[PDB]
Write an enzyme that holds these catalytic residues in place. Structure first.
Site, PDB file in Angstrom:
ATOM      1  N   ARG C  13       0.813  -1.212   0.000  1.00 13.46           N
ATOM      2  CA  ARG C  13       0.000   0.000   0.000  1.00 13.46           C
ATOM      3  C   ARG C  13       0.855   1.274   0.000  1.00 13.46           C
ATOM      4  O   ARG C  13       1.703   1.412  -0.892  1.00 13.46           O
ATOM      5  CB  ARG C  13      -1.024  -0.061   1.138  1.00 13.46           C
ATOM      6  CG  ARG C  13      -1.904  -1.332   1.080  1.00 13.46           C
ATOM      7  CD  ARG C  13      -2.687  -1.653   2.370  1.00 13.46           C
ATOM      8  NE  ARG C  13      -3.391  -0.472   2.878  1.00 13.46           N
ATOM      9  CZ  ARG C  13      -4.526   0.011   2.381  1.00 13.46           C
ATOM     10  NH1 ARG C  13      -5.131  -0.597   1.369  1.00 13.46           N
ATOM     11  NH2 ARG C  13      -5.064   1.107   2.908  1.00 13.46           N
ATOM     12  N   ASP C 158      -2.426  11.766  10.335  1.00 10.91           N
ATOM     13  CA  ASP C 158      -3.811  11.600   9.892  1.00 10.91           C
ATOM     14  C   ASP C 158      -4.523  12.944   9.780  1.00 10.91           C
ATOM     15  O   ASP C 158      -4.632  13.679  10.761  1.00 10.91           O
ATOM     16  CB  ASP C 158      -4.539  10.682  10.877  1.00 10.91           C
ATOM     17  CG  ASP C 158      -5.837  10.122  10.327  1.00 10.91           C
ATOM     18  OD1 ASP C 158      -6.615  10.849   9.644  1.00 10.91           O
ATOM     19  OD2 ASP C 158      -6.168   8.945  10.577  1.00 10.91           O
ATOM     20  N   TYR C 171      -5.996   4.806  18.747  1.00  4.98           N
ATOM     21  CA  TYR C 171      -5.354   5.108  17.487  1.00  4.98           C
ATOM     22  C   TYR C 171      -5.253   6.622  17.336  1.00  4.98           C
ATOM     23  O   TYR C 171      -4.195   7.143  16.980  1.00  4.98           O
ATOM     24  CB  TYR C 171      -6.129   4.502  16.303  1.00  4.98           C
ATOM     25  CG  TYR C 171      -5.779   5.137  14.960  1.00  4.98           C
ATOM     26  CD1 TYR C 171      -4.670   4.715  14.238  1.00  4.98           C
ATOM     27  CD2 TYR C 171      -6.545   6.186  14.432  1.00  4.98           C
ATOM     28  CE1 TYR C 171      -4.333   5.304  13.010  1.00  4.98           C
ATOM     29  CE2 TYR C 171      -6.206   6.790  13.208  1.00  4.98           C
ATOM     30  CZ  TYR C 171      -5.102   6.336  12.511  1.00  4.98           C
ATOM     31  OH  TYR C 171      -4.777   6.909  11.310  1.00  4.98           O
TER      32      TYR C 171
HETATM   33  N1  LIG Z   1      -4.769   4.716   4.134  1.00  2.45           N
HETATM   34  C1  LIG Z   1      -5.508   5.646   4.725  1.00  2.45           C
HETATM   35  O1  LIG Z   1      -6.826   5.922   4.316  1.00  2.45           O
HETATM   36  C2  LIG Z   1      -4.915   6.425   5.857  1.00  2.45           C
HETATM   37  C3  LIG Z   1      -3.613   6.168   6.273  1.00  2.45           C
HETATM   38  N2  LIG Z   1      -3.047   6.872   7.301  1.00  2.45           N
HETATM   39  C4  LIG Z   1      -1.668   6.580   7.727  1.00  2.45           C
HETATM   40  O2  LIG Z   1      -0.834   6.382   6.612  1.00  2.45           O
HETATM   41  C5  LIG Z   1       0.099   5.350   6.871  1.00  2.45           C
HETATM   42  C6  LIG Z   1       0.054   4.297   5.767  1.00  2.45           C
HETATM   43  O3  LIG Z   1      -1.274   3.950   5.461  1.00  2.45           O
HETATM   44  P1  LIG Z   1      -1.660   2.462   5.006  1.00  2.45           P
HETATM   45  O4  LIG Z   1      -0.775   2.102   3.879  1.00  2.45           O
HETATM   46  O5  LIG Z   1      -3.132   2.390   4.851  1.00  2.45           O
HETATM   47  O6  LIG Z   1      -1.240   1.628   6.326  1.00  2.45           O
HETATM   48  P2  LIG Z   1      -1.624   0.084   6.641  1.00  2.45           P
HETATM   49  O7  LIG Z   1      -2.870   0.054   7.412  1.00  2.45           O
HETATM   50  O8  LIG Z   1      -1.686  -0.801   5.391  1.00  2.45           O
HETATM   51  O9  LIG Z   1      -0.442  -0.397   7.596  1.00  2.45           O
HETATM   52  C7  LIG Z   1       0.894  -0.218   7.204  1.00  2.45           C
HETATM   53  C8  LIG Z   1       1.788  -1.319   7.752  1.00  2.45           C
HETATM   54  O10 LIG Z   1       2.053  -1.145   9.124  1.00  2.45           O
HETATM   55  C9  LIG Z   1       2.588  -2.368   9.584  1.00  2.45           C
HETATM   56  N3  LIG Z   1       2.274  -2.615  11.002  1.00  2.45           N
HETATM   57  C10 LIG Z   1       1.043  -2.631  11.593  1.00  2.45           C
HETATM   58  N4  LIG Z   1       1.213  -2.911  12.901  1.00  2.45           N
HETATM   59  C11 LIG Z   1       2.527  -3.082  13.154  1.00  2.45           C
HETATM   60  C12 LIG Z   1       3.245  -3.385  14.307  1.00  2.45           C
HETATM   61  N5  LIG Z   1       2.624  -3.768  15.417  1.00  2.45           N
HETATM   62  N6  LIG Z   1       4.620  -3.490  14.238  1.00  2.45           N
HETATM   63  C13 LIG Z   1       5.274  -3.306  13.040  1.00  2.45           C
HETATM   64  N7  LIG Z   1       4.552  -3.009  11.906  1.00  2.45           N
HETATM   65  C14 LIG Z   1       3.205  -2.897  11.961  1.00  2.45           C
HETATM   66  C15 LIG Z   1       2.026  -3.474   8.691  1.00  2.45           C
HETATM   67  O11 LIG Z   1       3.089  -4.216   8.111  1.00  2.45           O
HETATM   68  P3  LIG Z   1       3.041  -5.821   7.912  1.00  2.45           P
HETATM   69  O12 LIG Z   1       2.034  -6.147   6.808  1.00  2.45           O
HETATM   70  O13 LIG Z   1       4.384  -6.272   7.518  1.00  2.45           O
HETATM   71  O14 LIG Z   1       2.646  -6.554   9.208  1.00  2.45           O
HETATM   72  C16 LIG Z   1       1.206  -2.719   7.662  1.00  2.45           C
HETATM   73  O15 LIG Z   1       1.323  -3.244   6.363  1.00  2.45           O
HETATM   74  C17 LIG Z   1      -0.243   4.750   8.221  1.00  2.45           C
HETATM   75  O16 LIG Z   1       0.678   5.225   9.168  1.00  2.45           O
HETATM   76  C18 LIG Z   1      -1.618   5.290   8.531  1.00  2.45           C
HETATM   77  O17 LIG Z   1      -1.772   5.564   9.899  1.00  2.45           O
HETATM   78  C19 LIG Z   1      -3.739   7.853   7.969  1.00  2.45           C
HETATM   79  C20 LIG Z   1      -5.042   8.173   7.612  1.00  2.45           C
HETATM   80  C21 LIG Z   1      -5.668   7.409   6.493  1.00  2.45           C
END
Ligand SMILES: NC(=O)C1=CN([C@@H]2O[C@H](COP(=O)(O)OP(=O)(O)OC[C@H]3O[C@@H](n4cnc5c(N)ncnc54)[C@H](OP(=O)(O)O)[C@@H]3O)[C@@H](O)[C@H]2O)C=CC1
Ligand SMILES: NC(=O)C1=CN([C@@H]2O[C@H](COP(=O)(O)OP(=O)(O)OC[C@H]3O[C@@H](n4cnc5c(N)ncnc54)[C@H](OP(=O)(O)O)[C@@H]3O)[C@@H](O)[C@H]2O)C=CC1
Ligand SMILES: NC(=O)C1=CN([C@@H]2O[C@H](COP(=O)(O)OP(=O)(O)OC[C@H]3O[C@@H](n4cnc5c(N)ncnc54)[C@H](OP(=O)(O)O)[C@@H]3O)[C@@H](O)[C@H]2O)C=CC1
Ligand SMILES: NC(=O)C1=CN([C@@H]2O[C@H](COP(=O)(O)OP(=O)(O)OC[C@H]3O[C@@H](n4cnc5c(N)ncnc54)[C@H](OP(=O)(O)O)[C@@H]3O)[C@@H](O)[C@H]2O)C=CC1
Ligand SMILES: COc1cc(Cc2cnc(N)nc2N)cc(OC)c1OC
Ligand SMILES: COc1cc(Cc2cnc(N)nc2N)cc(OC)c1OC
Lengths: 266, 254, 256, 266
Positions: C13, C158, C171
């Site tokens: 993503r 965010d 969160y």
């Molecule tokens: N997409 C959206 O609509 C929005 C996104 N954001 C922010 O943008 C950023 C990226 O968005 P998006 O791509 O959707 O993010 P994702 O929800 O797809 O998460 C990103 C990655 O974070 C990793 N992750 C989750 N938990 C842990 C943990 N406990 N320890 C280590 N790694 C972890 C995972 O990796 P793995 O698969 O390897 O476990 C996951 O693929 C994020 O920080 C999010 O907060 C903010 C608002 C909206």
């Protein structure tokens, strides 16, 4: 006996503010533009409860010159502050409440509803407040330290929702942005004279019901707390508190009185 | 007779807040961590002016286990429970307890205790306390509920202009502001208001000459009075907002 | 000269688009992952195929918990992430705190309360803090003549947290902490010319709700967000620090 | 070949912005008020680099009527600026509200001055930008969908430091607050036409040195990153990026370009 000048004091929130200050012992200068009857009716009630505790002054706060040589907006604003000193010898509180509110769409003789809207909306909501503050500050500054009041307070009525603008109300929104700016600038500059300048920002208060009842219930139900618009007191009480000596450390801040409306999203 | 729980109520602002609420007729649960003597002396004064109007409860609000091992959540629930056990109600929560010391980003477990202490006291404990508070109101049958539920979070007017070297503390306050908005929105249906009060410089342990208004730090009352007002029924339409009580300090620049 | 970027949660993503974006600018990329091993490795292969030795992959749980060997703490695990960049390439120029857990923690209606807190708070706030500290020490420890000329840290925040999502308190709290970190770190690390900024997406690459966005009436593509991250890393943005840029198509301007 | 209108383009940040957009392939309408010589010199350089890639239009953006050849209002003068883009090149893709007066309007320690200042500061920094946007928007709206450009972008030059006001600059600060308001309102209303509206807020860029060296250094040594004011490019490059198709999801936001100045306190 402290004095308060409340612009647009004739009805709704302006009336509730004036009544609120009056109940704390303040003498009140009720300003009005068109609402002469209502203003005079309010003066009567206040003067009946406490002799010589109210007067009424008329003024167009729009950014235009008035009829005779012409009279400028600044002059008209100075005259409002002067009326307080002439009648009671003092002016401790200023509440910039007067405000025009109607659409100015960015999208569609005639240049009347054009140039007049800008000056009306910008003058009432921003330029007049500016001149009123200058005039207020000038009178405090001119008063010998030994005869100054001990609790000078200016309240600017702003808007809790302007960060999430109402579609089609650009100038009004712009005007409120200017007022917030004035609040911070004035707070900083007038701090050495112990004049506090703050803001109160309503969300939905005493919502006008000139629409289908369902559409009206539609708006008020969007407010997370109580699912309704606020009463005038729910807003005016906050203005009163900010004017009290118990709030003497607060300055340059805007207080949202919106029941969490600003926390919503579409 | 309404009840208020004030964390870190033993001295300074916490004390002034407790005294303020007490003067409005509230029964007060004074929380403390290390300040046992001071807390008990305050309870004595309040109980002397009005019999049975104060109790004291000890708790470490740091994000760690104590006394088998008791979690921070349990300790927080116990704080709220103490109010219900003694008086049968809890109307006001004031998250005031807070650790405040440097965590520099530029030069082991000394930071491990700092993280949990600063983040727990300033953010994690407040979260659990609110949860416990909200659970108790929700569990109370509607006809028996109080009419003025109010939660106040003590934030910071200056965190948008961070104090050099205080990263964790600053991060923790940012979390608390976030809690204020999220809780206000979720607890609105139960008529539980959640707001914040942000002091600038209050009752200092130099820089105070730079406060535009009065050129001094504030008194405890100048802050506590605002907390009291936000708790009054007059402020029932306010929720999810943070009120700066800083004398214009946040309007300055270097 | 080939600069190095560490991107947490880089497997898919946004994290993947960010890593691809930095790679197209000439950066060598350290792709961090937690569970997505297969995707991370497939991404490394593609990047290493276009440009030999331009990608590596490192695994780490960024949750605020101790793992077994004295247990390994979150701090140590974060230091190791930065160390991997120096060990393999001798430098670390860009840090992008993108990894993030996102699920509800309702206030109304046990092991999960303790694991949710540390997972959401660690990934979104405490890990980023330790990572920044580790990143800063390494820069500080490098002799001035040898330092890179464009140090940049991007925190994924965010745009909508001022208008919280119902039920997502921890969160939302975690993102608020991250914004706080952005400002504090920008101020403290300014003497070392390390810039710290934030990028705040609204609705991006979602898995009637998007029709509410004023611009285009849709969620954004990953590029529409990653391209902003790339620009803030460029030398052209060398005067920007301590600010958060919303990439939300005007979503934050709406009301119910 | 896309077109960009930059107000106050004659020098400093306005020039750098015009030069920046020109290097991306844009044809540029350079607006000026009193800097005719500098504007014409800039047009020459750009036109030498790429034939027919620059023109100039003179205009007072102050909120006053001027003398024709019936007076001419600010609105008309603003429409004429947008029109000049359509007449010469048949299109207008980017608008940059950069023109701005900046001088003190004190509240205390104290005619014709307190009259012309209001309209000059408020017009240049807010009222003109409003009218310009309105004109720009009708122009896009009036163009058949099939003939519209694919990257409409409006940038408003705001101020990173107005939340920490400069003592004695009340009208200016108020005007900037109005401009921020305009950025949010316009973004929302013009979203359906794919017109993005954003803000760029400088802190200290190319600081004027009509003061002792020490006083100038003092102000510069307060900026945390580099301990100096920015170059014009450090700001203009951001404006250029926000105009690029790569930024097509950003709208209604203000980007600080201040090197951490806004993070400081006294
Ligand atoms: N997409 C959206 O609509 C929005 C996104 N954001 C922010 O943008 C950023 C990226 O968005 P998006 O791509 O959707 O993010 P994702 O929800 O797809 O998460 C990103 C990655 O974070 C990793 N992750 C989750 N938990 C842990 C943990 N406990 N320890 C280590 N790694 C972890 C995972 O990796 P793995 O698969 O390897 O476990 C996951 O693929 C994020 O920080 C999010 O907060 C903010 C608002 C909206
Ligand atoms: N009520 C709400 O939902 C909200 C209110 N606010 C703010 O709160 C304040 C009070 O709200 P509310 O009671 O609804 O205000 P109103 O809309 O009822 O207006 C207040 C008064 O302003 C006066 N006024 C309008 N234009 C002028 C002018 N050109 N010159 C002089 N006076 C003028 C009018 O006085 P007269 O009748 O004598 O002509 C009017 O009664 C306002 O400043 C408003 O902006 C902000 C957000 C929401
Ligand atoms: N005063 C100021 O200038 C400013 C204050 N604030 C905020 O205002 C609030 C009150 O200010 P102030 O009176 O100065 O606060 P204090 O610094 O005096 O701290 C308040 C109390 O918190 C308690 N406490 C500290 N750590 C813990 C912990 N780990 N677990 C449980 N309790 C703990 C202590 O109680 P005990 O003695 O019993 O151990 C302490 O007395 C605080 O939340 C602070 O963040 C914000 C900005 C400025
Ligand atoms: N530079 C800085 O440190 C900061 C700048 N800003 C903002 O950045 C933008 C550009 O900065 P900067 O280059 O310093 O700006 P300048 O102060 O140099 O002014 C820009 C131009 O605006 C034009 N102008 C002024 N008044 C009017 C008017 N009444 N009608 C028409 N045009 C007018 C002038 O053009 P002409 O010469 O032709 O008369 C002037 O050259 C401005 O909007 C400013 O507010 C914000 C904070 C700091
Ligand atoms: C949320 O929608 C609306 C809200 C308001 C409230 C309002 C907002 N601002 C001011 N100054 N007065 C008001 N009455 C007024 C409205 O118009 C009457 C609305 O509909 C467009
Ligand atoms: C901090 O003090 C000052 C700051 C600025 C910055 C500045 C702020 N706004 C605008 N439009 N231009 C500027 N150059 C300009 C100044 O000069 C008038 C200052 O006074 C010495």
């Amino acid at each position: 006996v402290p004095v308060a000048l409340v612009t647009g004091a004739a009805k709704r929130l302006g009336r509730s503010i004036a009544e609120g200050l009056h109940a704390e012992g303040y003498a009140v200068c009720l300003h009005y533009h068109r609402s002469a009857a209502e203003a005079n009716a309010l003066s009567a009630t206040l003067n009946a409860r406490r002799p010589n505790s109210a007067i009424t002054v008329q003024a167009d706060l729009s950014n235009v010159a008035t009829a005779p040589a012409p009279v400028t907006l600044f002059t008209r604003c100075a005259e409002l502050v002067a009326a307080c000193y002439t009648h009671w010898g003092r002016c401790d509180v200023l509440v910039n409440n007067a405000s025009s509110f109607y659409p100015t769409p960015l999208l569609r003789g005639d240049r009347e509803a054009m140039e007049t809207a800008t000056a009306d909306l910008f003058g009432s909501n921003a330029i007049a407040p500016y001149f009123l503050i200058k005039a207020f500050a000038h009178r405090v500054a001119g008063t010998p330290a030994k005869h100054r009041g001990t609790n000078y307070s200016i309240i600017n009525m702003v808007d809790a929702m302007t960060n999430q603008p109402l579609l089609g109300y650009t100038i009004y929104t712009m005007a409120k942005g200017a007022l917030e700016g004035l609040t911070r600038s004035a707070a900083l500059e007038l701090a050495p004279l112990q004049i506090r300048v703050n803001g109160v920002g309503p969300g939905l208060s005493v919502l006008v019901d000139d629409m289908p009842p369902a559409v009206w219930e539609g708006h008020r139900s969007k407010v997370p707390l109580y699912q309704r618009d606020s009463s005038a007191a729910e807003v005016s009480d906050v203005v009163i508190f900010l004017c009290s000596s118990k709030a003497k450390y607060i300055t340059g801040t805007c207080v949202k009185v919106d029941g969490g409306y600003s926390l919503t999203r579409a």
